[PDB]
From a paper:
Polycomb repressive complex 2 (PRC2) is an essential component of the epigenetic machinery, regulating gene repression primarily through methylation of histone H3K27, which leads to changes in chromatin structure and thus exerts influence on key biological processes such as embryonic development.
Each compound in the structure is well defined in both unbiased Fo-Fc and refined 2Fo-Fc electron density maps The EZH2 peptide-bound EED structure is highly similar to the apo-EED structure with root mean-square deviation (RMSD) of 0.58 Å of 317 pairs of Cα atoms between the two structures. As illustrated by the biochemical results, all five compounds do indeed bind directly in the H3K27me3 pocket. As an exception, the benzodioxole moiety of EED396 engages in an edge-to-face interaction with the Arg367 side-chain. For instance, the dioxolane of EED396 makes a unique contact with Arg367 in the deep pocket. However, they exhibit significant induced conformational changes for residues Trp364 and Tyr365 (with a movement of the respective side-chain of more than 5Å), moderate changes for residues Arg367, Glu238, and Met256, and minor changes to residues Phe97 and Tyr148.
Residue numbers in the entry: 66 to 104, 111 to 280, 289 to 440
């Protein structure tokens, strides 16, 4: 007790960041997304633009190239990075209000292919952590869709009888990509196992190319975590982090305290809430939080330009865990943050088209 506190305090050199740079995008429209390539370079999405930037020494943010959609009415809400499974060259998927996924070559910032589900707004994209070809999209039409971008096939549609009853806003794969947790405007969080016999066969068939699987039932469902819509969800090992508009990110897990995630049945009625990360003034819809590659840091921006950064490695609920980052010129809603794979740079993007670079010192 005393010994472990003396050890924690003695070494303590708390997460500290300093704003080194800031930019404003000429379009003046909100930036909804930002992602560093984890496969130095980051992409931003907003309006009908996808902009590629590179971080340099002396806190410089360098504009590289931009993809401008021919449809000026397109509003991209999300982007995700992958790589070509053969050439190892990077790829970027983007999507938004039109409901079209564009696969962009970031070297030349050109769309090389595109996919359409039912043409409904796409709220988030995520690539499978083990298969660079498997792309998950979540939609305003209440479904999640799994695409094979190597064979251009829609592997599966997650939705139906027991699928989401309203817009799906976010989803995340676990570390091995055996399961997906999704959340949305119907206030629920649903687990979908993609290592089931049915999904393993659908993925194999997709690689032999199409008849898509329609997965009507999740492997777990809950509306017991939040009393309002859930706009962001991420896996934290075998635990889940999710948030609503109640100024808290909730850490939880399906079942009772001792229940193993792989033994949870669809009929499971219990949820264990381990704790919350509290903050203020972030009660507007569609504000994402993010973690670094190694999942040791959690960050969320609020509707007034304040950034919150929590240390996930402090297990003691009493100890200092939260660092707040402000800049007098950053007064707009921070919609998403992204950490560099090295976890030394944190970028925040805003409603007034501004980009904020924070360097970890
Ligand atoms: C068509 O224009 C607008 C659209 C939105 C808007 C934003 C988002 N989603 C929407 N459904 C929507 C809508 N409708 C869903 C996906 C999402 C994810 C986000 C996010 C925002 C969004 O931030 C963090 O991750 C807001 C302002 C607009 O317009 C002004 C620029 C005039
Ligand atoms: Pr610890």
């Amino acid at each position: 007790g005393i010994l472990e506190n003396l050890y924690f305090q003695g070494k303590k050199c708390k997460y500290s960041f300093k704003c080194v740079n800031s930019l404003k995008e000429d379009h003046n429209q909100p930036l909804f997304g930002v992602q560093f390539n984890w496969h130095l370079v980051f992409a931003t999405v907003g309006s009908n633009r996808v902009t590629l930037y590179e971080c340099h020494s002396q806190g410089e943010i360098r504009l590289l190239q931009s993809y401008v959609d021919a449809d000026a009415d397109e509003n991209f809400y999300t982007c995700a990075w992958t790589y070509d499974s053969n050439t190892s060259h990077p790829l970027l998927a983007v999507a938004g209000s039109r409901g079209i996924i564009r696969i962009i070559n970031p070297i030349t910032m050109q769309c090389i292919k595109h996919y359409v589900g039912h043409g409904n707004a796409i709220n988030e994209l995520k690539f499978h952590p083990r298969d660079p070809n498997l792309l998950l999209s979540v939609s305003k039409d209440h479904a999640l869709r799994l695409w094979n971008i190597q064979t251009d096939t829609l592997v599966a549609i997650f939705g139906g009888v027991e699928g989401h009853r309203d817009e799906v806003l976010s989803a995340d794969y676990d570390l091995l990509g055996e399961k997906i947790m999704s959340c949305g405007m119907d206030h629920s969080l649903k687990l979908w196992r993609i290592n089931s016999k049915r999904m393993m066969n659908a993925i194999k068939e997709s690689y032999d190319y199409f008849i898509s699987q329609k997965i009507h039932f999740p492997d777990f469902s809950t509306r017991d975590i939040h009393r309002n819509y859930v706009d962001c969800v991420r896996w934290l090992g075998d635990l889940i982090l999710s948030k609503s508009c109640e100024n808290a990110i909730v850490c939880w897990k399906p079942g009772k305290m001792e229940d193993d995630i792989d033994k949870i049945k669809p009929s499971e009625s219990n949820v264990t809430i381990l704790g919350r990360f509290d903050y203020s003034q972030c009660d507007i819809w569609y504000m994402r939080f993010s973690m670094d590659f190694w999942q040791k840091m959690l960050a969320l921006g609020n509707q007034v330009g304040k950034l919150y950064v929590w240390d996930l490695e402090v297990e003691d609920p009493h100890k200092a865990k939260c660092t707040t980052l402000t800049h007098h010129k950053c007064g707009a809603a921070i919609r998403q943050t992204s950490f560099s794979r090295d976890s030394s740079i944190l970028i925040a993007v805003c409603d007034d088209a501004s980009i904020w670079r924070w360097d970890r010192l």
